Amino acid sequence: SHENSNSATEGSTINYTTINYYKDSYAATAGKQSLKQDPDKFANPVKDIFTEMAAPLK
Amino acid sequence: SHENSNSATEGSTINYTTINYYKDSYAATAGKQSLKQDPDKFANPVKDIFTEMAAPLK
Amino acid sequence: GDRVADVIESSIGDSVSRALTHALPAPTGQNTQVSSHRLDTGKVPALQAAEIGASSNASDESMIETRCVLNSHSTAETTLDSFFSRAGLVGEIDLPLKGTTNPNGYANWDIDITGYAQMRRKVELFTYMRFDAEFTFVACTPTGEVVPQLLQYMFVPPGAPKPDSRESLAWQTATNPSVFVKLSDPPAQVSVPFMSPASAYQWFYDGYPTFGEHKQEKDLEYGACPNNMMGTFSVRTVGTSKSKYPLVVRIYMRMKHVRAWIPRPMRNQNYLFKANPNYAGNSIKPTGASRTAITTL
Amino acid sequence: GDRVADVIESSIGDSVSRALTHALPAPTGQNTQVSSHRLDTGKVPALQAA
Amino acid sequence: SDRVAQLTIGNSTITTQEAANIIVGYGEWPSYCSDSDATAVDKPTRPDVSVNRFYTLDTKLWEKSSKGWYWKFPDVLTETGVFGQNAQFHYLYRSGFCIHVQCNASKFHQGALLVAVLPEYVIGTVAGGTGTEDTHPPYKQTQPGADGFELQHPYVLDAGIPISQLTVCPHQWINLRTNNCATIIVPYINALPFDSALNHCNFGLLVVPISPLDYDQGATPVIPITITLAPMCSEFAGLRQAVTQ
Amino acid sequence: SDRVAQLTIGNSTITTQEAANIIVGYGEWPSYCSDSDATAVDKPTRPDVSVNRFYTLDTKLWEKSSKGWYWKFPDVLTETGVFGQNAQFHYLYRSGFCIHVQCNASKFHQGALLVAVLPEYVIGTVAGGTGTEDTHPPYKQTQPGADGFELQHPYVLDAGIPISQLTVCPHQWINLRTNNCATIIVPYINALPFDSALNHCNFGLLVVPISPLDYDQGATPVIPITITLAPMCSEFAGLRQAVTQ
Ligand SMILES: CCO/N=C/c1ccc(OCC[C@@H](C)CCN2CCN(c3ccncc3)C2=O)cc1
Numbered sequence: 001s002h003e004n005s006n007s008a009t010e011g012s013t014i015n016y017t018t019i020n021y022y023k024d025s026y027a028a029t030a031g032k033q034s035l036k037q038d039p040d041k042f043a044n045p046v047k048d049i050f051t052e053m054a055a056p057l058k
Numbered sequence: 059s060h061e062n063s064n065s066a067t068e069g070s071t072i073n074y075t076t077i078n079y080y081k082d083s084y085a086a087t088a089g090k091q092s093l094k095q096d097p098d099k100f101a102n103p104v105k106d107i108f109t110e111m112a113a114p115l116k
Numbered sequence: 117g118d119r120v121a122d123v124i125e126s127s128i129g130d131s132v133s134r135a136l137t138h139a140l141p142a143p144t145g146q147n148t149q150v151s152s153h154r155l156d157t158g159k160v161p162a163l164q165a166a167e168i169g170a171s172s173n174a175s176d177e178s179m180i181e182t183r184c185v186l187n188s189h190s191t192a193e194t195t196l197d198s199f200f201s202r203a204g205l206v207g208e209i210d211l212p213l214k215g216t217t218n219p220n221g222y223a224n225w226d227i228d229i230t231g232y233a234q235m236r237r238k239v240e241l242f243t244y245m246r247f248d249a250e251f252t253f254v255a256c257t258p259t260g261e262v263v264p265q266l267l268q269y270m271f272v273p274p275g276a277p278k279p280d281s282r283e284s285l286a287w288q289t290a291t292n293p294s295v296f297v298k299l300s301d302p303p304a305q306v307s308v309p310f311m312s313p314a315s316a317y318q319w320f321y322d323g324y325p326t327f328g329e330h331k332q333e334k335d336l337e338y339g340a341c342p343n344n345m346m347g348t349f350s351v352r353t354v355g356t357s358k359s360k361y362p363l364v365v366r367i368y369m370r371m372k373h374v375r376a377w378i379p380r381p382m383r384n385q386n387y388l389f390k391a392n393p394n395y396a397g398n399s400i401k402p403t404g405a406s407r408t409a410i411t412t413l
Numbered sequence: 414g415d416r417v418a419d420v421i422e423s424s425i426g427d428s429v430s431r432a433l434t435h436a437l438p439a440p441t442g443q444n445t446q447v448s449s450h451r452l453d454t455g456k457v458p459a460l461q462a463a
Numbered sequence: 464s465d466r467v468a469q470l471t472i473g474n475s476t477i478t479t480q481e482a483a484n485i486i487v488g489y490g491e492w493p494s495y496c497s498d499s500d501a502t503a504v505d506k507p508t509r510p511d512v513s514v515n516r517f518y519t520l521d522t523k524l525w526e527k528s529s530k531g532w533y534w535k536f537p538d539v540l541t542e543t544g545v546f547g548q549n550a551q552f553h554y555l556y557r558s559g560f561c562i563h564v565q566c567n568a569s570k571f572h573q574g575a576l577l578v579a580v581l582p583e584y585v586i587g588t589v590a591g592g593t594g595t596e597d598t599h600p601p602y603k604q605t606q607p608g609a610d611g612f613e614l615q616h617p618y619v620l621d622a623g624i625p626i627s628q629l630t631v632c633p634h635q636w637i638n639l640r641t642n643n644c645a646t647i648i649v650p651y652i653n654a655l656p657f658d659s660a661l662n663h664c665n666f667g668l669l670v671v672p673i674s675p676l677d678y679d680q681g682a683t684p685v686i687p688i689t690i691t692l693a694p695m696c697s698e699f700a701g702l703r704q705a706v707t708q
Numbered sequence: 709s710d711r712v713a714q715l716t717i718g719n720s721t722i723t724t725q726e727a728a729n730i731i732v733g734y735g736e737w738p739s740y741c742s743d744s745d746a747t748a749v750d751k752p753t754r755p756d757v758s759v760n761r762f763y764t765l766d767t768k769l770w771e772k773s774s775k776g777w778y779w780k781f782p783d784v785l786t787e788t789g790v791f792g793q794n795a796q797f798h799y800l801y802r803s804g805f806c807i808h809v810q811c812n813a814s815k816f817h818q819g820a821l822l823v824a825v826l827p828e829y830v831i832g833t834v835a836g837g838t839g840t841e842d843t844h845p846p847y848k849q850t851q852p853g854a855d856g857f858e859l860q861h862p863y864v865l866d867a868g869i870p871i872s873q874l875t876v877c878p879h880q881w882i883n884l885r886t887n888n889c890a891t892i893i894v895p896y897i898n899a900l901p902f903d904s905a906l907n908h909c910n911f912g913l914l915v916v917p918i919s920p921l922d923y924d925q926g927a928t929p930v931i932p933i934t935i936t937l938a939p940m941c942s943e944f945a946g947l948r949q950a951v952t953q
């Protein structure tokens with residue numbers, strides 16, 4: 001399928017696998033995406049990271 | 059697809075990519091076309107062209 | 117043979133149309149380059165000479181200090197096909213019961229899309245246009261209701277017999293293309309090729325279609341060019357008795373595989389007639405909004 | 414580090430004062446060279462623009 | 464070196480010492496019809512020098528109140544010189560044109576004319592003023608001949624279209640403080656390889672003052688605008704008796 | 709090709725079609741202070757485009773009796789734009805300047821202005837007329853701001869020195885029959901690497917008519933002289949609260 005690259009996720013780190021019948025990419029199905037996740041971005045955004053076994057404050 | 063070449067754009071500089079299910083080419087979709095453009099044809103049709111940094115009238 | 121010098125060195129006959137410019141690819145808008153302060157004598161981008169007839173070649177980079185900008189904005193949506201390949205209303209046909217216009221069950225529509233402003237103003241931006249088209253026919257009663265009625269649409273090219281009644285022999289349609297469809301069915305839809313005898317239809321023909329004295333009586337034919345007259349579109353309820361319901365057929369056109377030449381100024385006065393650019397003289401309006409003074413917003 | 418183009422190609426900071434002229438040695442006054450009659454069109458030393 | 468020019472074609476030569484370059488309409492030079500585009504089978508006649516030359520057809524006077532005029536091609540030459548004769552004897556005709564509008568004044572006069580070429584320049588009427596009358600322009604107005612015709616409503620080019628956008632067509636300006644002439648080369652423009660020089664006017668020439676002429680009491684008040692033009696690569700076919708319309 | 713020019717710096721562009729070259733004061737371009745000449749240790753701020761641009765500060769009217777005016781740098785910009793703000797918030801400042809004095813007329817007017825730059829332009833008083841009073845010029849006169857100040861005694865530049873010798877300083881002339889502007893690039897001039905934009909005026913700009921303006925009854929009599937200038941390689945240091953003097 002050689003179409004237009006106008007999907008909202010064009011140029012996204014997560015790899016999508018979809019189906020489509022029109023020249024416009026956004027008309028495609030939602031499909032399946034990559035299952036990567038980065039919890040630390042929200043749960044552990046400290047400058048100097050501390051280990052599980054250490055005393056957090058030293 | 060081996061059909062009839064009766065599209066209005068048959069023999070056109072701009073390359074089209076279309077879909078069709080009939081023996082007649084004009085029944086095809088509009089598709090995508092080549093993105094070439096020539097502004098100068100209308101915006102700068104002077105015989106002796108002048109540069110941006112020069113004095114147009116010398 | 118040719119022996120006399122002026123004939124040998126003649127240019128009489130070269131069919132090669134030498135062109136001053138050529139098209140380059142441009143999928144996206146132009147990028148902006150870094151620029152710095154220039155305090156030069158001799159070089160002067162800002163100064164132009166509009167009398168020449170060309171647009172200014174001054175660019176952002178030379179008029180102010182600019183940063184670098186990688187512009188990936190697409191130019192795809194402004195191609196002729198993107199602009200025109202959107203179906204719009206170009207004709208309406210009425211098939212009433214006890215009315216004045218068509219109380220006979222059939223109707224002949226002269227194939228002319230200049231009866232509707234929206235579509236018309238768009239195509240009139242160019243002088244010559246060559247294209248194929250997709251026509252869609254939407255039918256229903258005047259209330260937008262759908263009823264079990266069978267209809268026949270037929271394309272009658274110049275020279276073919278125009279139906280004179282709901283029962284005309286012409287509906288035998290042995291060679292003309294016809295379409296039979298119910299109001300209940302979805303809108304009928306077909307593809308139409310570029311049928312002109314010319315290389316392109318033209319929305320403007322500054323001339324007369326025939327020779328002879330062009331006296332007052334015949335001044336209605338000024339601007340009329342047969343190459344633009346593709347024929348008649350006839351429709352009828354399919355029966356020998358009057359239909360039980362009044363109908364309306366809206367005709368939509370969607371151009372495709374479009375080519376156009378010679379841009380023109382865009383219409384700025386209300387349209388009055390199909391066949392000409394006549395405008396209301398006592399009502400010439402400016403092209404846009406006006407204001408009280410040149411020094412105030 | 415610097416990554417944006419305008420910063421890389423910037424002149425902000427050069428301490429080198431570019432000079433249009435430089436000094437030449439001159440222990441004595443300038444000599445005078447032989448000259449002859451010039452009747453030229455185009456060349457015009459006498460005309461100035463103060 | 465761009466303000467000075469000489470146009471020589473046929474047995475005619477034009478000079479100007481205050482030009483502003485030359486415009487080549489839609490970026491392409493006039494050329495004879497190729498064997499691929501052609502459709503009529505008879506061998507054409509190409510008079511060359513006897514018809515491809517400069518004809519100086521008309522002069523108008525620019526006034527502080529002038530509205531602007533238009534002329535139609537090839538209507539302007541159909542009754543002039545060897546070109547006219549060929550246009551009359553033949554059914555088919557095609558050619559390009561080199562147009563040179565002249566208008567000089569003094570360094571104390573001011574004003575600007577827009578000189579443009581508008582293909583298929585169809586004329587409209589004011590429709591009875593109210594727009595309820597379906598009037599049509601008379602032959603004398605659609606094909607004014609060499610005398611041209613004065614515009615009634617310049618703002619809409621007597622055709623319901625804004626003159627403000629006329630610059631989208633091949634054009635030049637005659638700004639008295641800058642140049643005293645406009646030169647525009649135009650190739651054959653039509654959807655057919657050849658056509659009737661009589662029934663069809665391929666394009667119109669418009670000369671309209673956008674910035675009104677002005678000067679002080681005592682400066683020459685008679686400022687003419689003269690129209691000179693030359694067909695280019697003229698070709699004719701379909702010979703028969705002469706016909707004027 | 710020397711009479712035509714364009715100056716672009718920041719988001720500002722100047723054009724002239726009747727220039728007379730460009731002067732680069734004492735033969736050298738403005739440049740940032742080197743690590744050898746510098747003495748203050750704090751890292752400077754170099755706003756660049758927001759301050760190194762053309763500011764058009766004032767317009768004076770040239771009259772058949774005008775005496776001449778002067779402006780002081782950087783006094784003229786201390787209260788203008790982003791440049792002024794930086795000059796106020798920082799103790800230390802240094803920059804060069806591109807000065808462009810504008811004055812156009814007609815080919816029937818005549819007159820000549822001497823446009824010069826005089827470093828450390830100290831003003832003196834007439835000392836009570838007799839020279840027995842030790843008077844001193846008031847703040848309003850030593851630092852006139854954007855409005856500049858009119859010279860009292862041009863012949864001695866209000867400082868006991870002959871204007872006849874002012875040409876020993878970077879300068880140009882605006883001779884109406886020749887050019888309509890003067891352009892002078894000036895590097896930072898001082899015996900210290902940086903200094904206060906408030907307490908010290910590095911140099912003065914003088915615009916004095918040496919050959920009086922003249923014309924005939926009926927020619928435009930209002931002949932303005934406009935002053936535009938742009939800092940170059942501006943550097944500031946020693947940040948603190950804003951101070952106006
Ligand atoms: C089975 C029947 O189905 N047939 C449907 C159909 C639809 C359209 C058909 O032809 C459409 C031709 C139009 C695209 C031509 C429109 N044009 C060409 C230029 N032109 C025009 C009008 C007024 N002044 C100048 C030009 C036009 O109105 C023929 C058949």
Ligand SMILES: [Cl-]
Nearest residue numbers: 542543544545
């Ligand atoms: Cl004759």
Ligand SMILES: [Cl-]
Nearest residue numbers: 787788789790
């Ligand atoms: Cl401010």
